[PDB]
Amino acid sequence: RAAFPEATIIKPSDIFGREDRFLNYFASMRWFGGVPLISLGKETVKQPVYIVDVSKGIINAIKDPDAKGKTFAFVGPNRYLLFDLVQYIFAVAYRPFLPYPLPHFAYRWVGRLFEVSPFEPWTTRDKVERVHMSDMTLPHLPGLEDLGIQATPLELKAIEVLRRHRTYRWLTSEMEDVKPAKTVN
Amino acid sequence: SRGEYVVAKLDDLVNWARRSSLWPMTFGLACCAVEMMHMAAPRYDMDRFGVVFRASPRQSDVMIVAGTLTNKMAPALRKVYDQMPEPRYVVSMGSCANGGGYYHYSYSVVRGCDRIVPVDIYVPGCPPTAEALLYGILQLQRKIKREKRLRIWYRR
Amino acid sequence: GGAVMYPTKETAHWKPPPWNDVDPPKDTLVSNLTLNFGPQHPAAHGVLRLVM
Amino acid sequence: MPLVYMNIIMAFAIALAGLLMYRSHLMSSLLCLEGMMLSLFIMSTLIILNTHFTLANMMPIILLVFAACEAALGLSLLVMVSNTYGTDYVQNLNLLQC
Amino acid sequence: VKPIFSRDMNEAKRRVRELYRAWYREVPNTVHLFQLDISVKQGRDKVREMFMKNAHVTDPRVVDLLVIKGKMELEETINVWKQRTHIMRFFHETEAPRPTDFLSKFYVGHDP
Amino acid sequence: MTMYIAFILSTIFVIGFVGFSSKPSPIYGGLGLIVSGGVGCGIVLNFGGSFLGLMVFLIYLGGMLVVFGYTTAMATEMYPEVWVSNKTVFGAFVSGLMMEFCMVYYALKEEEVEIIFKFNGLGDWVIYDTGDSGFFSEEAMGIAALYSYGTWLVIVTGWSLLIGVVVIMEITRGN
Amino acid sequence: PPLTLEAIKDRVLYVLKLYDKIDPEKLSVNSHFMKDLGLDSLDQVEIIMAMEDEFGFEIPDIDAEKLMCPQEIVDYIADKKDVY
Amino acid sequence: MFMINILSLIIPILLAVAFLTLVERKVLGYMQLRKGPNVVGPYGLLQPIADALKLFTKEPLRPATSSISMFIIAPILALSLALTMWVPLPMPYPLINMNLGVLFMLAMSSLAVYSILWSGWASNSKYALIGALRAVAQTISYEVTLAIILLSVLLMNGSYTLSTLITTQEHIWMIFTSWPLAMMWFISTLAETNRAPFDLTEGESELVSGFNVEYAAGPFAMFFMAEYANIIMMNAFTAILFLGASHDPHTPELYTINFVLKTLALTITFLWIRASYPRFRYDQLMHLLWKSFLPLTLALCMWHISLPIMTASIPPQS
Amino acid sequence: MNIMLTLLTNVTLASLLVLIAFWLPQLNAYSEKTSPFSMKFFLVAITFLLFDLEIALLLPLPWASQTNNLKTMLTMALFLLILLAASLAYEWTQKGLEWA
Numbered sequence A: 001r002a003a004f005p006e007a008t009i010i011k012p013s014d015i016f017g018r019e020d021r022f023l024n025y026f027a028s029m030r031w032f033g034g035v036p037l038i039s040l041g042k043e044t045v046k047q048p049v050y051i052v053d054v055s056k057g058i059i060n061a062i063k064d065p066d067a068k069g070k071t072f073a074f075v076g077p078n079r080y081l082l083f084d085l086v087q088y089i090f091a092v093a094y095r096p097f098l099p100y101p102l103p104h105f106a107y108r109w110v111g112r113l114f115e116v117s118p119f120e121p122w123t124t125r126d127k128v129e130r131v132h133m134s135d136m137t138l139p140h141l142p143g144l145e146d147l148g149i150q151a152t153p154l155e156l157k158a159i160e161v162l163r164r165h166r167t168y169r170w171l172t173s174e175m176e177d178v179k180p181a182k183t184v185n
Numbered sequence B: 001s002r003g004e005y006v007v008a009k010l011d012d013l014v015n016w017a018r019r020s021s022l023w024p025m026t027f028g029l030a031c032c033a034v035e036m037m038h039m040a041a042p043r044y045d046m047d048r049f050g051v052v053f054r055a056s057p058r059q060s061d062v063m064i065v066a067g068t069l070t071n072k073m074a075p076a077l078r079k080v081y082d083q084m085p086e087p088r089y090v091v092s093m094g095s096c097a098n099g100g101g102y103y104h105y106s107y108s109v110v111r112g113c114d115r116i117v118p119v120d121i122y123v124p125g126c127p128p129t130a131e132a133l134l135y136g137i138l139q140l141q142r143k144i145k146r147e148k149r150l151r152i153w154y155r156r
Numbered sequence C: 001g002g003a004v005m006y007p008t009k010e011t012a013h014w015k016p017p018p019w020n021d022v023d024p025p026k027d028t029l030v031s032n033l034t035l036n037f038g039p040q041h042p043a044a045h046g047v048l049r050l051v052m
Numbered sequence D: 001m002p003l004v005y006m007n008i009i010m011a012f013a014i015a016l017a018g019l020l021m022y023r024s025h026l027m028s029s030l031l032c033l034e035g036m037m038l039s040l041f042i043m044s045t046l047i048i049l050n051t052h053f054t055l056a057n058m059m060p061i062i063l064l065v066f067a068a069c070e071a072a073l074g075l076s077l078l079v080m081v082s083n084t085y086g087t088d089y090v091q092n093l094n095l096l097q098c
Numbered sequence E: 001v002k003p004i005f006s007r008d009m010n011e012a013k014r015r016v017r018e019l020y021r022a023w024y025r026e027v028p029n030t031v032h033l034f035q036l037d038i039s040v041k042q043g044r045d046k047v048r049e050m051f052m053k054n055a056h057v058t059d060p061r062v063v064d065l066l067v068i069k070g071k072m073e074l075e076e077t078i079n080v081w082k083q084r085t086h087i088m089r090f091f092h093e094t095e096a097p098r099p100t101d102f103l104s105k106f107y108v109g110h111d112p
Numbered sequence F: 001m002t003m004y005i006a007f008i009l010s011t012i013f014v015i016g017f018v019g020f021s022s023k024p025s026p027i028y029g030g031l032g033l034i035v036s037g038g039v040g041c042g043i044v045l046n047f048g049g050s051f052l053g054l055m056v057f058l059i060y061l062g063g064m065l066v067v068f069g070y071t072t073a074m075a076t077e078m079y080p081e082v083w084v085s086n087k088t089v090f091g092a093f094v095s096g097l098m099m100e101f102c103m104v105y106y107a108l109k110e111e112e113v114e115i116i117f118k119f120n121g122l123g124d125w126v127i128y129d130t131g132d133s134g135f136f137s138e139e140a141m142g143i144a145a146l147y148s149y150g151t152w153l154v155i156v157t158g159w160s161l162l163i164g165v166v167v168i169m170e171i172t173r174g175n
Numbered sequence G: 001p002p003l004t005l006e007a008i009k010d011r012v013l014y015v016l017k018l019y020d021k022i023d024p025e026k027l028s029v030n031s032h033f034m035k036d037l038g039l040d041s042l043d044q045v046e047i048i049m050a051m052e053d054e055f056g057f058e059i060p061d062i063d064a065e066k067l068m069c070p071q072e073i074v075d076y077i078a079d080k081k082d083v084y
Numbered sequence H: 001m002f003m004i005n006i007l008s009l010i011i012p013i014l015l016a017v018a019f020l021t022l023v024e025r026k027v028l029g030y031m032q033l034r035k036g037p038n039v040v041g042p043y044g045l046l047q048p049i050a051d052a053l054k055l056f057t058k059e060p061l062r063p064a065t066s067s068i069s070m071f072i073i074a075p076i077l078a079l080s081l082a083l084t085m086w087v088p089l090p091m092p093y094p095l096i097n098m099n100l101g102v103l104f105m106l107a108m109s110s111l112a113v114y115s116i117l118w119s120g121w122a123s124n125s126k127y128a129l130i131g132a133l134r135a136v137a138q139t140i141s142y143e144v145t146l147a148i149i150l151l152s153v154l155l156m157n158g159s160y161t162l163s164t165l166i167t168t169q170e171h172i173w174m175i176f177t178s179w180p181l182a183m184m185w186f187i188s189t190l191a192e193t194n195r196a197p198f199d200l201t202e203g204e205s206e207l208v209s210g211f212n213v214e215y216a217a218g219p220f221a222m223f224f225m226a227e228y229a230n231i232i233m234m235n236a237f238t239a240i241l242f243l244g245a246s247h248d249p250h251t252p253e254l255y256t257i258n259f260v261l262k263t264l265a266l267t268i269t270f271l272w273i274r275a276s277y278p279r280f281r282y283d284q285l286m287h288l289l290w291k292s293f294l295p296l297t298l299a300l301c302m303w304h305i306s307l308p309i310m311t312a313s314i315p316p317q318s
Numbered sequence I: 001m002n003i004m005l006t007l008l009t010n011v012t013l014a015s016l017l018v019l020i021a022f023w024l025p026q027l028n029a030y031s032e033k034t035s036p037f038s039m040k041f042f043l044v045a046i047t048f049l050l051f052d053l054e055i056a057l058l059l060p061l062p063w064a065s066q067t068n069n070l071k072t073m074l075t076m077a078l079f080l081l082i083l084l085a086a087s088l089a090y091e092w093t094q095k096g097l098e099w100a
């Protein structure tokens, strides 16, 4: 803002998509033993925005003249508790949900072992801190609707995003689909 | 730096391995497949260079789009490209594959295979003579030789 | 003439065994596998989607 | 009796119990049949080798000859059952009652 | 005038009803087989829209010909002749919305 | 440790038997049977039965169960059932290992275990004989006497195999 | 398991209720679909498909077009299922 | 030092497989008026290194998603059995001297089919499963003749001990005695090793890659190494069984040279056959074995039983 | 112990290669790639079994040739071989050898 006074600094929330790092992260947490959940994710309300929505928001901000010098904030259509979101992820993926909460000291040795790795501390600990943080609600900043784009619900786009993680677990057993995550709104 | 030297030598090794053993896939749609076979024919035999035709996309490293890519054939071409493991390189042979060629204005022709899959080397010709195709393959080998994957990794 | 003498309620619903044979179910043993022969196939000349 | 005899007799007992407790598949039960035959082969071979019953060293072979005959019969039945029901499931062998 | 399949508009309507029935029941199978991400209701709504597109037709032969084309498309979808791309082509997802009011058209381009 | 190779092998044999007896998908059952057959060959070889044990490796592992596998492949199930797939299968698998451990420990701790028979914990090397067989393989000569002495066995076994071919044909006719 | 006429009516009414385009309040056994409920021909086709799904018997087109009264659906189902 | 001997058997065999790949490529090229790989190293000697490195650095695709334990065991079993089957061979002194090394090799060959059996199944594809089934049938069909022919020829050896084959053929090659059996045995080796004209398993022209269609990078390399090691081992078994070599007890080098040369000749014959003939149809393959070969093998087995009795040439048991 | 050593070494070597080929190259950084009929001809497999049984019965023949009752041995060996040939001929003539 100092260098570019009229720059449009967009402030997006968690972004999910086909090549996401947020949803896919939770999907791959199943590989990492059980499902590590700080406070069982009961203190982390999340509001994920769809990648296509974010991109189109950026484009429209570029096109629209009013966007200049406006700190836009991209928020997801709904807010979910971390537990709810992770549960829905494991449901659409049909992966066995093994949520073990993380006591600070007890799982701190696990985090220390992750850091002890001679390579990066498993994408640093700051990523785990991000997981250990609910999305800020900043209504003063303009949102997607201000640009005209309407945020697509996660539930509709979750299937596409997490079908890649869907394995014979769902391929062999078509069964039925799952139910939307609990919305803390 | 010593680390940079080790990284550079390792990247030289892997690039040499990949360019020496280039396994194109048996993918020929139209006329240019004939000149491709003539490249495989004894006169310009590609096997000397390590170029061996392997049918399996999963066991193949380069895709040669030899022929006109129709709208009906395009999804299959994309699928076979995606099933191909990486590192993967695409060589477009023929004016038809490069930009549509003779049938550029046809309703049923994709105006170039670059629209469907990324292309590394474009071989002009209609048909490109087998020597031109061998030249394009060797140019692809030089392109692999110039790759600096491990150097970029070390610089991060 | 019942399927079984002194039939219980559950057995009462059950029909008597057939006179000669059991009626076979609808297939469910074998079918015709459908294969896309080409187009990438070596023998398909590259542009033949032979649905066999 | 040395402990190896105990182990092999235990293996036969376990295989017998597995055969007598089906779950769904007939092939698993036929596997238990073949397994029991293996236990019997090993037991007979150990007995005959230890006692130097030279003329009985062929008994294990005949046992296996008829073991494979029985296995073959079992598979020949299993294929027909699968054809008539679509699975090898034991629960489909229900037409005959009492 | 020689009838293609129906001598009257009513018979063509009966054939349309049959074709609609078949498409309606086929839609969930299409969604399952092609692994489409749309819902069954969404697909059936698209089917309804496509059928209403041809509603204005007031000639029995045209209705019969449209029915033939619908049957051919349904046979393609029932088999796996059509790919996921072909099935989703009905849903013009990539194409950007084209505004229809006069003022937007005037802004965008010279097109009438 | 090499003093009780036969016992270690017998325990592995029992474990494989628990594996295919718990009834996972016939693939894993086949694996357990294959391991058990190899281990039984090992025990037989240790007792001096090279030929007999090798027979299991070929006419049992590469024979009866080689087709068992070919069969399961034709009748493919939707999911490969494993020990953990069903709680009962996993539970029985663990209990079977535990049962073996209990008898094994009892046999070693109590010089004389008596489950249904009486077993002595002394190593199997004790029972072996100190005689010499000279320029001969006793197992080989006994097995080869099937043609010189066991002519009646040869007749009955050959007839049974021929009737087995006919029987399998008739059963697979299916009318 | 006597397949009562009132049970058939209940199943028919439940099926009609599930259909969103029909407003539940004005739904009645005698409410003709086209006029009372305002649904179109394809709508009627869909509801007949729902009915034949619920009762498990296929309704041909000629019989289906004679419908458009829920009471007609119930009595047709009774005729095909031989009720009374 | 026994571990040293194990390594000396293992690593050179793998190097021989690696260079057998180049040899095959060059021979096929020259019989097709082409030149084999020659850019990569002097006369193409460095091509296998490039091939291996390229394979290893390549992406490890794995959409098997079913019994990954099996999908990993199959390559392990294949490579391990290919390496093990080399152990009992006397060249001229075997690494492990078994009274019944021949039956051991038969059992190991029968087991090695499970590698193809599992790989194709755990792949959980279409071509993979059906191709694996065709494999089972192929190997199983020729295993019968392989055993009968082997029994028929060993009737002259007097034992299943591989080492005594050298003594038996001290004065003449056993091919002179049993050439019809030799021809059938050679075709049998071809079928068992899944080589052209019986390359139905992989069958690239018909099945995209067969059982290994879903195997890439290293596991595919292990399958390739197992295949070629089996080729060399089966040709070595043929050389020991029929084309016997003179063995001077004080200088084993002469026998080793002669044996190696004969095995090389037979492997070159394998490549030559791969180049010449087209592939037998799956159906025709079985027709050639059960209906055409199996009979003649039975007749020759009767003859080779009868001959020692009627010629008083029963070989010594020891 | 020699045979056990050989088995161990070979298995460990092959498994080591499988490790260096399943995990070691799996580290290399990449991205996302997405991704039966009842065979009645199995009768051939079953017939293999019953023929493999005769195969087993015939293996003792090299030692069987060392007996003094060579007449009885030869008669029984040819008896088994002729029974096998008869079985093959029966399956052949009854079209039981319907391969593929």
Ligand code: SF4
Pocket (backbone or CB within 6 Å): B030, B031, B032, B066, B067, B068, B093, B094, B095, B096, B097, B101, B102, B125, B126, B127, B128
């Ligand atoms: S560029 Fe020419 S030769 Fe190649 S496919 Fe097109 S028309 Fe044929």
